[PDB]
Amino acid sequence: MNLQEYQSKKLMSDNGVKVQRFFVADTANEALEAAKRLNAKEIVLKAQILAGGRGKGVFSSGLKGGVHLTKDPEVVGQLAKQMIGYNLATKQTPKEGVKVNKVMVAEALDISRETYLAILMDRSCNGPVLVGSPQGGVDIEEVAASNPELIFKEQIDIIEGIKDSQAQRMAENLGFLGPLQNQAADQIKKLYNLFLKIDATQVEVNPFGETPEGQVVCFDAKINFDDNAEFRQKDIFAMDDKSENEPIENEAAKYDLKYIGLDGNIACFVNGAGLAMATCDIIFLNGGKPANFLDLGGGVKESQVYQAFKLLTADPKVEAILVNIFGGIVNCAIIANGITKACRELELKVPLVVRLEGTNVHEAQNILTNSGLPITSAVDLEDAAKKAVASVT
Amino acid sequence: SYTASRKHLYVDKNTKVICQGFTGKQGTFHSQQALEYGTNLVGGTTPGKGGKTHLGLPVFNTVKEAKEQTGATASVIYVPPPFAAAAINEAIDAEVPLVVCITEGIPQQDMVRVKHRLLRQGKTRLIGPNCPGVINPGECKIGIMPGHIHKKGRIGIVSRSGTLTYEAVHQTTQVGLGQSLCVGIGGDPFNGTDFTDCLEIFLNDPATEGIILIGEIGGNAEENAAEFLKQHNSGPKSKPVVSFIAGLTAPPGRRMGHAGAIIAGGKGGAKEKITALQSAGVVVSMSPAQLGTTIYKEFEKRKML
């Protein structure tokens, strides 16, 4: 899960990390009166959406840019007007982008030096890791490419804890001279602990830096939380809005279902994630355009086949459906029945293609073909895909 | 070393199992199914009731107990998310040979703390978490996989997913090939056993003549696999390796079901995984529907039928 920038700075602040002073706004007037209330040389007004890209993004008020700097409390106001209420699209959001309901009016700051520092669990390291380059400001993945030697790492020992020498070793590699160093390092230590404290898969700071006035500041930072640790991070997840989550996606979760939309017209739904990915793939391999990805887990249950279909009903981009269910733990006719029960009972009017596999598959297929419904039994996953595809040309 | 416990993965008719989380609505269902199949399920832990009998079988309050008492050599866990990692450690404590954590949802931080330890002791070996388990068809089944779809045979199978594996197994038997040993290593990012761990076992198994490797987006386990095969499977007696990787159509930045199934920071995509294994001699099936027919042909070319 991800929180809004104003929520994660809050959080960083309460755990001793130094960030810019700031105010949150729901109206263009609160924003404007906030820039006056700050009282400073310059001001950063940043729309709040979880998708990165805000900088170069474009609003639907016509306004270009999700991030703006101005010393005049007024420019803030006029700019705000064009954000609250509108949608922001970025190189990272759906073509019509996310709606914006709050802006952040924080005090700009002089960035003397710009560095990159991030903390995560590394997939080859097992155990925390500090990743930082003295060349902050730019998109890490580019430094990594152009100058691999400006990327330092410090594996950390999950039992031991971060070592003073490591924070110093990093601070050093990051560019902090003499005095500043011991303050950099202590911020690093404070982040690492924040990181373990909150069950983050990642705490990224970019830029991490220094003001001319002598402070070590995380001017920007992204934080990814481990969705599995929610049961022990209720405070943090309480802040998760869900305002931004896609609708069908939201509904689907209520029923332990896991949905994700693609831009096609052939929906599908499978039991098991691996097989749901493979299903979207085989469709495409055969010329289709999968409409979504749906995983029911290993929890087949007449109830879900129903909500599962219910959902598909939503996306009116859908022209067909492929059901790939590998039974194993249950009789395939019970599944066929529930499929059809749910189908008439949901007055469907789109071609259905089912591929059931497991136990008692023959009678199960009989039910699907002897249903009167616009259903079609499929022999295997390839047959299933070929049909669904044919079914919409 | 941890490396040195790989051998415990090869469960068989001699292996005796205890189910941590025995009276739970889950350990219940699978124990009736494990015994039916024909597995050496001796009992199960469940603090509190630690002295009664469940399913015509003994119950203990702890892992350490039930080990000694029943002699047992493998522990399977069905303990809910918040405690599941505790259970792994309670198993590594009593030095159990094989630990299979079925549980999905365990905090990733928990598992890094677990592997911290797990990579130090050599008595225990962990498969999981978030995995269907392991099966030596006909001899031993520890997990939630439908047994009747397996046929003892020649193909060693290793996968990060559950049902997709079932597809493969079904597809292999239908061409009559069968399996030697199947290991579902799970869909989580940090786990006790990876691909290479299993490939060593298959590469030195005489019973294993071919290998099917099922992967997906996220992480580098696939790329390490391709590396390992280049190094240990080239030359005059290499075994054929067939593979499918899911997620070619997955959008980036999203969690495709499994916690570890996510393309992040530009890393974890299928295309690069597929290109690496190919570079190591691995024939990669394009359709997941063709793993049986694909490895079948490989055997036929080498005239191994």
XYZ file of C-alpha atoms in Angstrom:
698
model
C 0.000 0.000 0.000
C 1.052 3.659 -0.439
C 0.061 6.777 1.534
C -0.258 10.375 0.433
C 2.965 12.414 0.677
C 1.535 14.486 3.455
C 0.830 11.301 5.467
C 4.200 9.790 4.991
C 6.067 13.041 5.921
C 3.949 13.238 9.011
C 5.016 9.723 9.809
C 8.653 10.403 9.039
C 8.426 13.475 11.186
C 7.051 11.659 14.162
C 9.888 9.198 14.032
C 12.530 11.904 14.077
C 13.301 12.484 10.398
C 13.600 16.169 9.340
C 11.304 17.286 6.529
C 9.879 20.533 5.218
C 7.293 22.380 7.282
C 3.967 21.978 5.548
C 0.245 22.392 5.418
C -2.476 20.249 3.783
C -5.452 21.807 1.979
C -8.923 20.684 0.839
C -9.849 24.041 -0.825
C -7.999 26.619 -3.044
C -8.525 29.139 -0.267
C -7.039 27.028 2.478
C -4.096 26.453 0.174
C -3.736 30.157 -0.551
C -4.175 31.059 3.168
C -1.674 28.324 3.947
C 1.110 29.861 1.782
C 0.560 33.121 3.701
C 0.456 31.243 7.003
C 3.731 29.492 6.315
C 5.646 32.711 5.748
C 8.811 32.068 3.764
C 11.000 32.940 0.788
C 9.518 30.373 -1.603
C 6.704 27.774 -1.626
C 6.142 24.295 -3.118
C 2.512 23.461 -3.869
C 2.128 19.788 -4.701
C -1.053 17.975 -5.659
C -1.602 14.746 -3.726
C -1.971 11.544 -5.701
C -0.079 8.236 -5.094
C 1.152 7.946 -8.678
C 4.638 9.369 -9.230
C 4.986 11.784 -12.153
C 3.164 14.802 -10.695
C 5.965 17.143 -11.805
C 5.555 16.800 -15.545
C 1.922 15.587 -15.308
C -1.123 17.479 -16.664
C -4.378 18.462 -14.956
C -7.810 18.355 -16.466
C -8.326 22.037 -15.573
C -5.844 22.465 -18.391
C -3.033 23.188 -15.910
C 0.252 21.540 -16.806
C 2.254 20.350 -13.793
C 1.474 18.790 -10.433
C 4.332 20.575 -8.667
C 4.976 24.326 -8.523
C 7.349 26.838 -6.873
C 6.356 30.473 -6.164
C 7.177 33.067 -3.546
C 3.744 34.653 -3.824
C 0.878 33.295 -1.664
C -1.348 34.374 -4.571
C 0.091 32.236 -7.317
C -0.613 29.377 -4.889
C -4.329 30.230 -4.782
C -4.799 30.647 -8.535
C -2.867 27.391 -9.086
C -4.897 25.605 -6.373
C -8.189 26.530 -8.041
C -7.032 24.463 -10.934
C -6.200 21.358 -8.914
C -8.751 20.533 -6.248
C -11.597 18.831 -8.086
C -9.691 18.017 -11.265
C -7.828 14.933 -12.385
C -4.120 14.529 -12.755
C -2.577 12.248 -15.334
C 1.062 11.327 -15.302
C 3.476 9.093 -17.156
C 2.202 6.685 -14.440
C -1.601 6.885 -14.277
C -4.603 5.877 -16.406
C -4.975 8.179 -19.416
C -7.612 10.295 -17.661
C -5.633 10.267 -14.408
C -6.559 10.388 -10.730
C -8.882 12.992 -9.118
C -7.185 15.344 -6.565
C -8.839 16.230 -3.256
C -6.053 17.819 -1.301
C -2.886 19.772 -2.035
C 0.197 20.222 0.091
C 1.514 23.721 0.636
C 4.996 23.302 2.079
C 7.913 25.667 2.449
C 10.342 25.308 -0.423
C 13.896 25.064 0.770
C 17.273 25.727 -0.662
C 18.801 22.484 -1.621
C 22.492 22.948 -1.228
C 23.402 19.316 -2.078
C 21.074 16.619 -3.598
C 21.662 12.948 -2.755
C 19.932 9.582 -3.247
C 19.299 7.277 -0.264
C 16.858 4.372 0.007
C 16.223 1.403 2.210
C 14.597 -1.961 1.320
C 14.894 -5.715 1.757
C 17.054 -6.882 -1.093
C 15.964 -9.813 -3.147
C 19.486 -11.210 -3.411
C 20.816 -10.085 -0.072
C 18.279 -11.345 2.414
C 18.160 -8.676 5.036
C 17.900 -4.862 4.853
C 20.188 -2.844 2.544
C 21.054 0.899 2.180
C 21.202 2.103 -1.434
C 22.515 5.610 -1.898
C 24.293 7.713 -4.506
C 25.891 11.162 -3.957
C 24.199 11.945 -7.211
C 20.650 12.503 -6.055
C 18.081 14.555 -7.908
C 17.684 12.142 -10.757
C 15.804 8.890 -11.287
C 18.056 6.277 -9.666
C 17.541 3.838 -12.490
C 19.412 6.243 -14.712
C 22.386 6.886 -12.467
C 22.600 3.113 -12.073
C 22.892 2.919 -15.863
C 25.238 5.866 -16.676
C 27.400 5.708 -13.589
C 27.203 2.421 -11.742
C 30.097 3.518 -9.537
C 28.103 6.288 -7.908
C 25.866 3.621 -6.302
C 26.937 2.444 -2.895
C 25.307 -0.262 -0.793
C 25.533 -1.317 2.829
C 24.005 -4.611 3.769
C 22.507 -4.437 7.234
C 22.036 -7.229 9.754
C 18.410 -7.680 10.707
C 19.345 -9.219 14.092
C 22.301 -6.973 14.833
C 20.863 -3.629 13.769
C 22.406 -0.860 11.665
C 25.980 -0.097 12.665
C 27.242 3.385 13.450
C 30.171 2.728 11.144
C 27.844 1.878 8.276
C 25.832 5.098 8.625
C 29.162 6.961 8.697
C 30.454 4.933 5.766
C 27.323 5.831 3.800
C 26.997 9.468 4.936
C 30.558 9.719 3.727
C 29.933 8.179 0.264
C 26.859 10.399 -0.047
C 28.917 13.602 -0.004
C 28.480 14.937 3.557
C 31.588 16.781 4.774
C 32.897 16.723 8.316
C 30.292 18.198 10.728
C 27.247 17.510 8.575
C 28.331 13.853 8.470
C 27.363 12.836 11.993
C 23.942 14.472 11.449
C 23.440 12.757 8.071
C 24.246 9.407 9.576
C 21.882 9.871 12.502
C 19.044 10.635 10.049
C 19.995 7.454 8.161
C 19.798 5.520 11.451
C 16.456 7.086 12.145
C 15.119 6.131 8.720
C 16.321 2.535 8.933
C 14.460 2.143 12.254
C 11.397 3.903 10.832
C 11.604 1.372 8.015
C 11.676 -1.666 10.248
C 9.144 -0.090 12.557
C 6.571 0.383 9.879
C 6.921 -2.831 7.820
C 7.903 -1.010 4.738
C 9.060 -2.938 1.752
C 10.767 0.322 0.875
C 11.546 3.800 2.210
C 12.985 5.928 -0.677
C 14.320 9.495 -0.196
C 15.031 11.577 -3.258
C 16.409 14.148 -2.791
C 18.032 13.552 0.579
C 20.108 16.644 1.378
C 21.461 19.783 2.935
C 20.222 23.356 3.203
C 22.597 26.283 3.111
C 21.584 26.795 6.775
C 23.246 23.488 7.805
C 20.379 20.935 8.030
C 20.052 17.377 6.696
C 16.601 17.116 5.046
C 14.535 14.469 3.215
C 12.821 16.859 0.829
C 11.117 14.041 -1.032
C 10.398 10.464 -0.219
C 8.324 7.481 -1.352
C 7.303 4.664 1.034
C 5.872 1.241 0.143
C 4.178 -0.752 2.932
C 4.025 -4.528 3.115
C 0.351 -5.397 2.675
C 0.863 -8.577 4.767
C 1.805 -6.652 7.931
C -1.458 -4.720 7.916
C -2.875 -6.818 10.856
C -0.082 -5.241 12.909
C -0.088 -1.710 11.399
C -3.754 -0.702 11.865
C -2.809 2.954 12.568
C -0.905 3.198 9.343
C -3.470 1.389 7.229
C -6.204 3.446 8.829
C -4.791 6.364 6.798
C -5.131 4.396 3.533
C -7.832 6.259 1.692
C -8.792 3.698 -0.983
C -10.182 6.802 -2.695
C -7.664 6.310 -5.453
C -8.080 2.574 -5.919
C -9.918 1.545 -9.079
C -13.616 0.712 -8.361
C -13.917 -2.913 -9.554
C -10.615 -3.533 -7.820
C -12.149 -2.253 -4.570
C -15.285 -4.317 -4.804
C -13.390 -7.456 -5.686
C -11.340 -7.260 -2.502
C -14.411 -7.416 -0.278
C -14.706 -11.078 -1.358
C -11.039 -12.105 -1.005
C -10.931 -11.818 -4.855
C -7.929 -10.140 -6.506
C -8.708 -8.133 -9.627
C -6.537 -6.011 -11.985
C -7.689 -4.373 -15.175
C -6.055 -4.480 -18.558
C -7.243 -2.642 -21.662
C -8.961 -5.501 -23.461
C -12.397 -6.927 -24.188
C -11.962 -10.535 -23.137
C -12.327 -10.874 -19.412
C -11.285 -13.985 -17.554
C -11.171 -15.459 -14.078
C -9.053 -18.257 -12.692
C -8.216 -19.916 -9.359
C -4.542 -19.341 -8.401
C -2.363 -16.343 -9.343
C 0.162 -18.183 -11.454
C -2.620 -19.633 -13.565
C -4.406 -16.285 -13.773
C -1.284 -14.726 -15.174
C -0.836 -17.662 -17.615
C -4.489 -17.212 -18.640
C -4.063 -13.523 -19.617
C -0.954 -14.609 -21.483
C -2.402 -17.448 -23.481
C -5.322 -15.232 -24.568
C -2.901 -12.596 -25.907
C -0.609 -15.184 -27.484
C -3.620 -16.231 -29.531
C -4.531 -12.706 -30.577
C -6.843 -11.609 -27.827
C -6.779 -8.624 -25.508
C -7.364 -9.797 -21.920
C -9.778 -7.489 -20.141
C -8.469 -8.125 -16.648
C -6.736 -10.591 -14.379
C -8.842 -12.144 -11.627
C -7.613 -14.508 -8.965
C -10.135 -16.243 -6.666
C -7.388 -17.929 -4.763
C -7.975 -21.594 -3.941
C -11.354 -20.544 -2.573
C -13.922 -21.715 -5.088
C -17.357 -21.322 -3.477
C -20.685 -20.803 -5.253
C -20.780 -17.361 -3.540
C -17.639 -16.104 -5.340
C -18.229 -17.480 -8.788
C -21.192 -15.141 -8.339
C -19.386 -12.020 -7.129
C -16.640 -12.843 -9.643
C -19.102 -12.760 -12.457
C -20.907 -9.870 -10.855
C -17.706 -7.834 -11.126
C -17.028 -8.714 -14.715
C -20.524 -7.310 -15.374
C -19.166 -3.852 -14.441
C -16.441 -3.225 -17.113
C -18.661 -2.582 -20.176
C -15.555 -2.939 -22.324
C -15.957 -6.706 -21.979
C -17.161 -8.689 -24.957
C -16.401 -12.209 -23.743
C -15.322 -14.295 -20.797
C -12.965 -17.240 -20.259
C -13.215 -19.195 -17.021
C -10.187 -21.274 -16.221
C -10.664 -23.283 -13.117
C -8.566 -26.228 -12.145
C -10.633 -28.163 -9.630
C -8.459 -30.672 -7.755
C -10.132 -30.069 -4.344
C -13.808 -30.634 -5.468
C -16.183 -32.113 -8.046
C -16.261 -30.155 -11.319
C -20.010 -30.525 -11.768
C -20.673 -28.598 -8.521
C -18.578 -25.795 -10.060
C -20.391 -26.057 -13.412
C -23.727 -25.853 -11.597
C -22.723 -22.807 -9.572
C -21.459 -21.287 -12.734
C -24.822 -21.643 -14.415
C -26.830 -20.829 -11.281
C -24.867 -17.601 -11.066
C -25.250 -17.066 -14.808
C -29.021 -17.161 -15.396
C -29.295 -15.577 -11.953
C -27.182 -12.763 -13.348
C -29.055 -12.546 -16.654
C -25.862 -12.560 -18.738
C -25.608 -11.520 -22.351
C -21.923 -12.046 -23.317
C -20.356 -15.245 -24.760
C -18.944 -17.448 -22.016
C -16.122 -20.043 -22.550
C -15.425 -22.384 -19.686
C -12.569 -24.765 -19.146
C -13.009 -26.872 -16.031
C -10.509 -29.487 -15.072
C -10.214 -31.898 -12.182
C -12.879 -34.425 -11.124
C -15.957 -35.568 -12.948
C -15.213 -33.265 -15.847
C -17.477 -34.981 -18.396
C -20.840 -34.439 -16.667
C -19.626 -31.018 -15.631
C -19.228 -30.164 -19.294
C -22.640 -31.611 -20.025
C -24.226 -29.099 -17.651
C -22.431 -26.174 -19.390
C -23.475 -27.202 -22.869
C -26.947 -28.377 -21.704
C -27.804 -25.111 -19.908
C -29.526 -23.127 -22.640
C -27.122 -20.354 -21.631
C -24.649 -18.775 -24.089
C -21.893 -20.952 -22.594
C -19.205 -23.097 -24.412
C -17.152 -25.875 -22.772
C -13.444 -25.979 -23.686
C -11.135 -28.918 -23.885
C -7.967 -27.305 -22.550
C -6.417 -23.952 -21.905
C -5.380 -23.530 -25.556
C -8.811 -24.513 -26.861
C -10.321 -22.139 -24.268
C -8.166 -19.220 -25.470
C -8.680 -19.859 -29.259
C -12.444 -19.824 -28.758
C -12.827 -16.821 -26.488
C -10.821 -15.044 -29.160
C -12.989 -16.296 -32.086
C -15.981 -15.404 -29.973
C -15.311 -11.651 -30.543
C -14.184 -10.836 -34.076
C 25.463 -24.941 5.985
C 21.957 -24.418 4.679
C 23.054 -25.737 1.296
C 23.685 -29.057 3.054
C 19.985 -29.560 3.891
C 18.794 -29.565 0.294
C 18.698 -33.322 0.494
C 15.755 -33.188 2.919
C 13.513 -31.982 0.040
C 13.318 -35.522 -1.405
C 10.471 -36.805 0.802
C 9.414 -40.452 0.308
C 7.340 -43.359 1.656
C 9.717 -43.492 4.613
C 9.063 -39.936 5.758
C 6.839 -39.343 8.791
C 4.913 -36.076 9.056
C 3.379 -33.982 11.847
C 1.019 -31.079 11.070
C 1.605 -27.908 13.146
C -1.869 -26.473 13.422
C -3.705 -29.804 13.534
C -7.180 -28.987 14.895
C -7.463 -25.862 12.758
C -10.182 -25.825 10.102
C -7.276 -26.247 7.608
C -4.960 -28.779 9.217
C -8.135 -30.795 9.564
C -9.081 -31.076 5.930
C -5.551 -31.757 4.671
C -4.731 -34.395 7.238
C -7.758 -36.490 6.184
C -6.554 -35.993 2.602
C -2.926 -36.733 3.425
C -3.789 -40.048 5.103
C -6.137 -41.082 2.310
C -3.440 -40.458 -0.336
C -1.172 -42.607 1.751
C 1.163 -40.354 3.719
C 2.952 -41.053 6.988
C 0.981 -38.477 9.003
C 1.653 -39.378 12.657
C -0.080 -36.444 14.452
C 0.087 -32.706 14.968
C 0.677 -29.810 17.349
C -1.929 -27.316 18.592
C -1.158 -25.613 21.968
C -3.817 -26.140 24.586
C -5.197 -29.483 23.368
C -1.670 -30.906 23.521
C -2.491 -34.399 24.791
C -5.726 -35.512 23.057
C -6.404 -37.329 19.785
C -7.505 -35.842 16.470
C -8.705 -37.971 13.496
C -7.811 -41.341 15.067
C -4.371 -39.831 15.850
C -2.210 -38.268 18.697
C -1.995 -34.476 19.536
C 0.830 -32.547 21.317
C 1.173 -28.961 22.775
C 4.443 -28.374 21.008
C 6.683 -29.283 18.089
C 9.686 -30.276 20.221
C 7.479 -32.906 22.032
C 5.695 -34.595 19.155
C 9.065 -34.907 17.383
C 10.675 -37.224 19.924
C 7.428 -38.970 20.874
C 6.570 -39.804 17.198
C 10.101 -39.946 15.791
C 8.764 -37.867 12.836
C 10.903 -36.096 10.194
C 8.804 -33.433 8.511
C 6.630 -30.600 9.726
C 3.945 -28.877 7.716
C 2.376 -25.631 8.931
C -1.136 -24.344 8.499
C -0.834 -21.694 11.235
C -2.523 -18.303 10.404
C -0.382 -15.356 9.122
C 0.554 -13.579 12.433
C 1.995 -16.695 14.062
C 3.094 -18.825 11.083
C 6.697 -17.585 11.271
C 6.822 -18.399 14.957
C 5.888 -21.924 13.966
C 8.708 -22.048 11.401
C 11.207 -21.097 14.147
C 9.576 -23.564 16.591
C 10.357 -26.195 13.963
C 13.938 -25.071 13.304
C 14.450 -25.158 17.090
C 13.577 -28.793 17.542
C 15.897 -29.332 14.577
C 13.225 -30.854 12.199
C 14.605 -32.087 8.837
C 12.012 -30.723 6.497
C 9.694 -27.816 7.160
C 6.926 -26.916 4.692
C 5.101 -23.646 5.417
C 1.864 -23.515 3.492
C 0.719 -20.246 5.028
C 0.139 -17.179 2.867
C 0.336 -13.604 4.247
C 3.348 -13.792 6.493
C 5.017 -10.347 6.928
C 8.068 -10.046 4.697
C 10.045 -8.644 7.615
C 9.201 -11.809 9.620
C 10.652 -14.014 6.808
C 13.920 -12.052 6.563
C 14.313 -12.576 10.279
C 13.529 -16.272 9.685
C 16.024 -16.681 6.866
C 18.589 -14.921 9.025
C 18.465 -17.875 11.284
C 17.590 -20.578 8.731
C 20.764 -19.804 6.768
C 22.891 -20.590 9.826
C 21.616 -24.039 10.960
C 21.939 -27.020 8.667
C 19.644 -29.517 10.329
C 16.518 -27.884 8.926
C 15.366 -27.100 5.428
C 12.387 -24.943 4.645
C 10.114 -24.904 1.618
C 7.881 -21.867 1.689
C 6.198 -19.916 2.764
C 3.053 -19.358 0.665
C 3.554 -22.725 -1.105
C 1.379 -25.813 -1.909
C 4.125 -28.114 -0.773
C 6.045 -31.094 -2.040
C 5.065 -34.448 -3.556
C 6.920 -37.643 -4.348
C 4.051 -39.313 -6.222
C 2.965 -42.640 -4.744
C 5.457 -42.376 -1.882
C 4.801 -39.017 -0.069
C 2.579 -35.856 -0.216
C 3.008 -32.872 2.162
C 0.823 -29.994 1.168
C -2.445 -28.918 -0.401
C -1.987 -30.401 -3.836
C -4.480 -32.776 -5.418
C -2.659 -36.097 -5.341
C -4.648 -38.168 -7.770
C -3.328 -36.031 -10.621
C 0.267 -37.228 -10.153
C 1.782 -40.349 -11.692
C 5.164 -41.535 -10.495
C 7.641 -41.039 -13.332
C 10.574 -39.143 -14.839
C 10.026 -35.379 -14.664
C 11.242 -33.253 -11.727
C 8.993 -30.220 -11.274
C 9.750 -26.894 -9.514
C 7.300 -23.975 -9.538
C 6.559 -20.674 -7.812
C 2.840 -21.197 -8.293
C 0.136 -23.578 -7.175
C -2.541 -24.402 -9.729
C -0.370 -23.558 -12.747
C 1.748 -26.486 -11.573
C -1.308 -28.640 -11.596
C -1.711 -27.788 -15.230
C 1.810 -28.998 -15.955
C 1.441 -32.210 -13.993
C -1.834 -32.948 -15.672
C -0.260 -32.206 -19.024
C 2.693 -34.425 -18.374
C 0.729 -37.516 -17.247
C -1.700 -37.157 -20.161
C 1.267 -37.694 -22.538
C 2.200 -40.474 -20.104
C 5.366 -39.003 -18.701
C 4.804 -38.887 -14.897
C 6.808 -37.126 -12.118
C 9.754 -37.990 -9.869
C 9.464 -35.182 -7.367
C 7.473 -31.951 -7.440
C 8.367 -28.943 -5.349
C 6.244 -25.822 -5.168
C 8.639 -23.230 -3.660
C 5.926 -20.619 -3.190
C 4.874 -17.190 -4.397
C 6.627 -15.042 -1.735
C 9.770 -12.934 -2.205
C 11.785 -14.363 0.695
C 11.597 -18.137 1.110
C 13.459 -21.150 2.389
C 14.094 -22.943 -0.914
C 14.664 -21.600 -4.336
C 14.899 -23.097 -7.901
C 18.646 -23.899 -7.953
C 18.151 -25.673 -4.644
C 15.746 -28.031 -6.406
C 17.692 -28.272 -9.665
C 20.749 -29.569 -7.849
C 18.479 -32.347 -6.472
C 16.962 -33.109 -9.905
C 20.322 -32.925 -11.688
C 21.746 -35.611 -9.362
C 18.588 -37.717 -9.276
C 18.872 -40.795 -11.470
C 15.070 -41.080 -11.381
C 14.867 -37.565 -12.833
C 15.441 -37.490 -16.609
C 13.812 -34.200 -17.409
C 12.823 -31.040 -15.615
C 9.980 -28.586 -15.926
C 10.526 -25.150 -14.304
C 7.513 -22.857 -13.784
C 8.134 -19.213 -12.926
C 6.605 -15.735 -13.134
C 7.385 -12.043 -12.893
C 9.202 -10.644 -9.839
C 12.618 -11.290 -8.317
C 15.718 -12.939 -9.788
C 15.328 -16.626 -8.755
C 14.764 -17.449 -12.456
C 17.896 -15.689 -13.517
C 19.913 -17.571 -10.865
C 18.420 -20.755 -12.168
C 19.555 -19.983 -15.706
C 22.975 -19.240 -14.308
C 23.169 -22.490 -12.390
C 22.102 -24.567 -15.358
C 24.690 -22.969 -17.629
C 27.257 -24.029 -15.088
C 26.025 -27.466 -14.061
C 23.868 -28.696 -16.986
C 25.954 -28.229 -20.131
C 27.948 -30.925 -21.713
C 27.478 -34.555 -22.859
C 24.959 -35.585 -20.246
C 22.663 -32.661 -19.653
C 19.010 -33.314 -18.782
C 16.374 -31.502 -20.866
C 14.698 -28.573 -19.152
C 11.381 -27.197 -20.189
C 9.951 -23.991 -18.797
C 7.078 -21.541 -18.721
C 7.165 -18.079 -17.044
C 3.964 -16.214 -16.320
C 3.387 -12.536 -16.445
C 4.235 -11.564 -19.980
C 1.052 -9.494 -20.005
C 1.335 -8.341 -16.434
C 1.299 -4.557 -16.038
C 4.233 -3.165 -13.982
C 3.886 -1.843 -10.478
C 1.100 -4.283 -9.593
C 1.004 -7.288 -7.261
C -0.350 -10.151 -9.445
C -1.807 -12.144 -6.625
C 1.346 -13.626 -5.116
C 3.226 -11.148 -2.886
C 6.455 -11.703 -4.895
C 4.770 -11.425 -8.313
C 5.493 -7.787 -9.048
C 7.628 -6.002 -11.594
C 9.302 -3.172 -9.517
C 11.892 -0.492 -10.238
C 12.174 -1.869 -13.719
C 13.186 -5.264 -12.359
C 11.335 -8.592 -12.489
C 9.833 -8.800 -15.967
C 9.178 -12.070 -17.796
C 10.949 -11.285 -21.106
C 14.338 -11.073 -19.399
C 13.652 -14.269 -17.478
C 12.762 -16.143 -20.612
C 15.821 -14.879 -22.482
C 18.135 -15.968 -19.681
C 16.874 -19.527 -19.342
C 17.000 -19.901 -23.135
C 20.581 -18.805 -23.059
C 21.122 -21.761 -20.641
C 19.703 -24.444 -22.950
C 16.208 -24.352 -21.440
C 13.474 -24.820 -24.075
C 10.755 -22.361 -23.096
C 7.180 -23.197 -23.972
C 5.401 -20.162 -25.299
C 1.907 -21.348 -24.347
C 1.408 -22.616 -20.821
C -0.864 -25.100 -22.450
C 2.106 -26.916 -24.074
C 4.441 -28.014 -21.301
C 3.534 -31.682 -21.682
C 3.852 -31.739 -25.446
C 7.007 -29.605 -25.286
C 8.942 -31.832 -22.873
C 7.535 -34.855 -24.625
C 9.270 -33.796 -27.890
C 12.475 -33.088 -26.034
C 12.538 -36.672 -24.757
C 11.668 -37.921 -28.247
C 14.508 -35.955 -29.893
C 17.078 -37.385 -27.457
C 15.238 -40.666 -28.032
C 14.600 -41.086 -24.291
C 11.004 -42.332 -24.658
